[PDB]
């Protein structure tokens, strides 16, 4: 086991350390069947690293960051009922709302049609979808820590991901889950800090 090893630091680079695909959310949507459907007809998730402890910790090693963002969507559906479910292949709208732009509030909201918001139209059964958002920060680096206040009497916007099913009047309820795999790319970091414990994570 005790092996002679030459100098090798390539895998401790910032890119090697950070640029690794990792699921950051599991969005869920149900097919637009007019049966009992709520909330359910569309999913929304504000992009954030603060919901997964691995990426959060690795970033909070530092104060400031910059990185592009390779999102990859793994969709998985199935019939909700014992019902002998027959359903033509569904299409999923995966909309990326850029920072500081309106969010969908309904399945039929105007935002879904908006030209601003880039949308993927993903046909189920095909390869997982993918987009690469660039550094969309207002400042010149994503700040994980911000000593300061909004008003004088922390948080940074990466965008929003909204998802719906485009197929309209489906007879059989098809539940679907979209695992979002985020992979930071072209990562730069500044001003290292101590890691936290695994305490408030």
């Amino acid at each position: 086991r005790h092996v002679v090893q030459h100098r090798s630091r390539s895998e401790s680079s910032i890119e090697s350390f950070f640029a690794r695909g990792a699921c950051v959310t599991i969005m869920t949507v149900d097919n637009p069947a007019s049966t009992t459907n709520k909330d359910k007809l569309f999913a929304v998730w504000k992009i954030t690293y603060k919901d997964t402890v691995q990426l959060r910790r690795k970033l909070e090693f530092f104060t400031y960051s910059r990185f592009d963002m390779e999102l990859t969507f793994v969709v998985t559906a199935n019939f909700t009922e014992t019902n002998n479910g027959h359903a033509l292949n569904q299409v999923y709208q995966i909309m990326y709302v850029p920072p500081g732009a309106p969010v969908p509030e309904k399945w039929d909201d105007y935002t879904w049609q908006t030209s601003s918001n880039p949308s993927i139209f993903y046909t189920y059964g095909t390869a997982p979808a993918r987009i690469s958002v660039p550094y969309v920060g207002i400042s010149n680096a994503y700040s994980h820590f911000y000593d300061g206040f909004s008003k004088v009497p922390s948080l940074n916007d990466f965008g929003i991901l909204a998802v719906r099913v485009v197929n309209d009047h489906n007879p059989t309820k098809v539940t679907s889950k979209i695992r979002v795999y985020l992979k930071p790319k072209h990562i730069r970091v500044w001003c290292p800090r101590p890691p936290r414990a695994v305490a408030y994570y």
Binding site: H2, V3, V4, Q5, H6
Partner: protein, 238 residues
């Protein structure tokens, strides 16, 4: 011709190094710079410990099935080599195993001397059992591993894939094997792990005229070569 070889305070006599084998045609060598590191740090005591050590002789008979030794194990009580093999934590060494064998012209038989890398024997699950030390173990014809299988379920006729020599008494009565350091690592623990294993099996059995000496001596003389270890090497900064 009779060549008398001295290593340190130790002298042996060799009839001739006429047929002295080098496993894989690779001579023992220190850990080269391309595979070394100034931060994984070796030292070279190949001054004193690297001498001839002559194990206690074994007696070949008509009934003998074979003998075996492990390395560096056999030399774990052999003076400075045995000391270094316990003081140091990591070590590497080649060997020169000169199996001399003393017989008349009226004895007959043949030995196969085989040097085996990673000679894992079996009837194995025990250190003391798998490492008999200086005296080595012996084979069988049915723990002690099996003659024709080398212990490792392995027809002895194919054993000649290993580095080897044949001591056929009518011709040569001695064999030499120059073993380089062979391991998956450049350096490793000597006490926990035996790299080489010597196995001497009578291919042709001993036989002799009427009232000759009934049991002849096989003598092993093992010389460590390019013995090098760790690594006490500390830097104290001002």
């Amino acid at each position: 011709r009779v060549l008398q070889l001295t290593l340190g305070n130790s002298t042996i006599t060799t009839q001739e190094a006429a047929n002295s084998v080098v496993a894989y045609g690779r001579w023992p060598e220190y850990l080269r710079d391309s595979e070394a590191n100034p931060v994984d740090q070796p030292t070279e005591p190949d001054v004193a410990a690297c001498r001839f050590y002559t194990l206690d002789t074994v007696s070949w008979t008509k009934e003998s099935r074979g003998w075996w030794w492990k390395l560096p194990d056999a030399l774990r009580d052999m003076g400075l080599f045995g000391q270094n093999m316990y003081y140091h934590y990591l070590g590497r060494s080649g060997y020169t195993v000169h199996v001399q064998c003393n017989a008349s012209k009226f004895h007959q038989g043949a030995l196969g001397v085989f040097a085996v890398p990673e000679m894992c024997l079996a009837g194995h699950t025990s250190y003391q059992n798998a490492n008999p030390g200086e005296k080595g173990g012996t084979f069988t014809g049915t723990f002690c591993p099996v003659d024709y299988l080398l212990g490792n379920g392995t027809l002895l006729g194919n054993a000649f894939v290993f580095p080897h020599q044949i001591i056929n008494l009518r011709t040569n009565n001695c064999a030499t094997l120059v073993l380089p350091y062979v391991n998956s690592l450049s350096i490793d623990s000597m006490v926990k792990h035996n790299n080489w294993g010597i196995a001497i099996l009578p291919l042709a059995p001993l036989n002799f005229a009427s009232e000759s000496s009934p049991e002849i001596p096989i003598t092993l003389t093992i010389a460590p070569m390019c013995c090098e270890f760790n690594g006490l090497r500390n830097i104290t900064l001002p």
